Amino acid sequence: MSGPRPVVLSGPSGAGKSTLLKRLLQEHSGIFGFSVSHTTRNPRPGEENGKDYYFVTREVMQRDIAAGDFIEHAEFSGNLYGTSKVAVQAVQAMNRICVLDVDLQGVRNIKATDLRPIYISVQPPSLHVLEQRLRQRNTETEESLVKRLAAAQADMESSKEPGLFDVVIINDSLDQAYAELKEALSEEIKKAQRT
Amino acid sequence: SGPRPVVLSGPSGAGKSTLLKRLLQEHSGIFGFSVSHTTRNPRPGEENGKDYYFVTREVMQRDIAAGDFIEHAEFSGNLYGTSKVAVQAVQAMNRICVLDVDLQGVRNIKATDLRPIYISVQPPSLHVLEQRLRQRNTETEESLVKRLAAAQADMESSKEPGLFDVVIINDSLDQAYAELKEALSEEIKKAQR
Numbered sequence: 001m002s003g004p005r006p007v008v009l010s011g012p013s014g015a016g017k018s019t020l021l022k023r024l025l026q027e028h029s030g031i032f033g034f035s036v037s038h039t040t041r042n043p044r045p046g047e048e049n050g051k052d053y054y055f056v057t058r059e060v061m062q063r064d065i066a067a068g069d070f071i072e073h074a075e076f077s078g079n080l081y082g083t084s085k086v087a088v089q090a091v092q093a094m095n096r097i098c099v100l101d102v103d104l105q106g107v108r109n110i111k112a113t114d115l116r117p118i119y120i121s122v123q124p125p126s127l128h129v130l131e132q133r134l135r136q137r138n139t140e141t142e143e144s145l146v147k148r149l150a151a152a153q154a155d156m157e158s159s160k161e162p163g164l165f166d167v168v169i170i171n172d173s174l175d176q177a178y179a180e181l182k183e184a185l186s187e188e189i190k191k192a193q194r195t
Numbered sequence: 196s197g198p199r200p201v202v203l204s205g206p207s208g209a210g211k212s213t214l215l216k217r218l219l220q221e222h223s224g225i226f227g228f229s230v231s232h233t234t235r236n237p238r239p240g241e242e243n244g245k246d247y248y249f250v251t252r253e254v255m256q257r258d259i260a261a262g263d264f265i266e267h268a269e270f271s272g273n274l275y276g277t278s279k280v281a282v283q284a285v286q287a288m289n290r291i292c293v294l295d296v297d298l299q300g301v302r303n304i305k306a307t308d309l310r311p312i313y314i315s316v317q318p319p320s321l322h323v324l325e326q327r328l329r330q331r332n333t334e335t336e337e338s339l340v341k342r343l344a345a346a347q348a349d350m351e352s353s354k355e356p357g358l359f360d361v362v363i364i365n366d367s368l369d370q371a372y373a374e375l376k377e378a379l380s381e382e383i384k385k386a387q388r
């Protein structure tokens with residue numbers, strides 16, 4: 001169980017967490033790791049059990065969740081997905097920082113476990129800016145843009161809760177936000193680099 | 196060597212561009228996009244080799260004729276295009292280069308020695324494409340009519356044997372996105388290693 005502390009990275013989808021995470025991985029090859037999640041969906045060609053996912057049934061996933069084996073879980077497109085404590089510890093055993101990129105529900109689920117991650121939220125400067133960035137993409141209809149913005153406002157309002165996040169990064173500019181992210185993780189990166 | 200590029204096509208606004216954006220956003224270390232060449236003048240903040248490769252019309256025309264480009268088009272009096280080298284540069288990083296192009300682009304890429312996976316993202320019907328375009332695009336009926344005629348030509352061409360490796364019907368974005376991931380699962384496994 002010795003090794004780098006996991007990082008829970010959250011904030012509204014589209015507000016920057018994904019872009020910052022890609023730069024983090026690109027600039028620090030061999031430092032970060034993703035846990036092998038469990039899923040109830042059928043494996044696709046080329047996917048391997050124990051590497052891409054632990055492919056289990058709904059009955060097994062529910063039994064393991066009830067036993068307290070998971071740090072977080074959620075439903076996506078008719079299938080269950082989740083991160084086991086063992087999968088996180090497996091990344092930690094490789095001297096890697098396990099990145100848990102989750103939504104607010106995921107943050108709250110992980111907060112209810114005995115894991116001690118660093119909690120970071122990446123926020124847009126405003127809901128207006130998030131809306132303009134999402135409108136610039138053309139991935140939304142007015143209705144889907146509205147549903148996304150309502151969920152994003154709930155996330156933004158909850159990000160202000162005292163003690164919820166260790167670091168809240170306001171993404172005014174990607175380079176500035178990335179520098180704050182690297183600074184927040186500098187002590188754990190240094191540990192994963194020199195071991 | 197490296198992951199095969201993916202050429203995503205289908206009618207404009209039928210889902211291909213939304214799926215490409217989602218693919219890139221949700222994945223880490225797997226997908227990449229190539230840096231295009233352009234003959235337009237660079238603007239403030241633009242950097243050669245990052246935003247575009249900035250070349251003259253004389254050079255771009257010579258290079259297109261030499262077979263250096265996989266696809267190209269004219270826009271506002273300037274040439275834009277994807278070179279084979281820019282795609283191979285993404286492939287060299289063990290990444291899947293995603294190419295979002297129209298039918299003409301698909302046919303141009305078919306004429307190169309690249310071996311991409313060709314995927315068409317289709318609306319369930321022309322009527323459903325029309326209702327989706329009316330909901331979003333703030334357009335005139337005439338402009339909607341011209342777009343629907345181009346879309347029907349694309350839908351008819353998507354049925355051509357051997358043109359597309361996979362034809363995904365975009366009933367709903369999440370369903371179409373799951374099928375896109377299934378179609379690329381073997382190449383994603385290569386990029387994940």
Ligand SMILES: C[C@@]1(F)[C@H](O)[C@@H](COP(=O)(O)O)O[C@H]1n1cnc2c(=O)[nH]c(N)nc21
Binds near residue numbers: 041072106221376
């Ligand atoms: C990260 C995702 F949103 C993915 O985009 C989606 C679908 O994954 P796939 O079936 O592998 O295309 O499933 C979600 N997902 C994939 N793995 C997990 C997980 O461990 N926990 C949670 N809460 N969600 C997970």
Ligand SMILES: C[C@@]1(F)[C@H](O)[C@@H](COP(=O)(O)O)O[C@H]1n1cnc2c(=O)[nH]c(N)nc21
Binds near residue numbers: 231276
């Ligand atoms: C995608 C665009 F329609 C752009 O919207 C337009 C103008 O680009 P810009 O001058 O940078 O706004 O040029 C087009 N364009 C920009 N790069 C390319 C390209 O590589 N291939 C094709 N076929 N078109 C390209």
